[PDB]
Every structure is written in C-alpha cells, then in structure tokens.
C-alpha cells in the first residue's frame, strides 16, 4: 500500500565548465502501517519532482517485517557502514523514542514501542540500511513455547 514519509533533502552539484550545475536528491520511506515497508532514493532537478521519483522506487523492492504487534521480538543490534544501531522492545505506554531517521522507519512499519539508539556516524541515508538489516532478519518463533520452544523452532 502507501503511506509516505520524507526524511532528507540535499543540494548536490556538478562542475562542468562555465558554471556549476545543481541537482536535488531525496530519501523517502513508504510503509503500510502493518509491517510492510520500503525506502527509496531519487535524484532530479527540483524539489516537487525529486520527491515523486523517490516515492515510486520505494513501493518497489519492499520488505515484510514480522512484528509482535506494536513491539519487536527481542533486543537486537545491527550495523552497516560506520553506523551501529541498537533496538529493544519496550512497555505499552512508552511511544517511539529514536532519532530523526529511525522514527520514520519505525512509524510506517506500525511498531510503537521500539526504544532505539544509533551510534557511530549518523548518516540518514545510511542508518536506514543499518535498520533494514535488523528488521528483515527477524525470526517470529514458530514454536510450541519459548522456555520450552527449542525442539520445533530450531528445525525451522
């Protein structure tokens, strides 16, 4: 589906000769409010056209996320580049408390109780990779129990 959310806008450039050609980039994540997200990056020549391009690439190559219901399954920790990310599920009344670019991922996924923090280099185009290695590699235990459930899930 489609619920859109913008994060970043830049002004990249390019020197040719004579002057300097400008261009705009944008980063936009799209989710469904249930656990299907997708991010997208587009470059164009103006703001109202660079956002439209980044929205279209978001709703291609999406991710199914197996959330527990407004929370996560377990504390995990993933990294990409020089960016390290930590996330652990929380109680009911606590909302989402994260920084800038992990709120926009964790809104549209539908989770509400995420309690996150990012270390290392804060790059909004690169902390998103650090988040999607984490969420796309969840497990959601298909087991008979948890304190007992290590005889039917390990064979899954």
């Amino acid at each position: 589906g489609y619920i859109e959310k913008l994060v970043q806008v830049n002004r990249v450039a390019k020197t040719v000769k004579g002057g300097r050609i400008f261009a705009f980039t944008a980063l936009t994540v799209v989710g469904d409010g249930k656990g299907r997200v997708g991010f997208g990056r587009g470059k164009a020549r103006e703001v109202p056209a660079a956002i439209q391009k980044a929205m279209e690439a978001a709703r291609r190559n999406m991710i199914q996320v197996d959330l527990n219901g407004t929370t996560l399954q377990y504390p995990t920790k993933s990294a990409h580049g020089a960016s390290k990310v930590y996330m652990q599920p929380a109680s009911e009344g606590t909302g989402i408390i994260a920084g800038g670019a992990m709120r926009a991922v964790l809104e549209v996924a539908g989770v509400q109780n995420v309690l996150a923090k990012c270390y290392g280099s804060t790059n909004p185009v690169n902390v998103v990779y650090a988040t999607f290695k984490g969420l796309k590699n969840m497990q959601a235990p298909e087991a008979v129990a948890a304190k007992r459930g290590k005889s039917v899930e390990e064979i899954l």
Binding site: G95, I96, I97, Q112
Partner: peptide
Amino acid sequence: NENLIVELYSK
C-alpha cells in the same frame, strides 16, 4: 494523542 506528549518530555 497519548503518544506525542509522552514523547515530548524525553527530549
């Protein structure tokens, strides 16, 4: 909304 006032008093 009970999920904007709670988040305001963190930072």
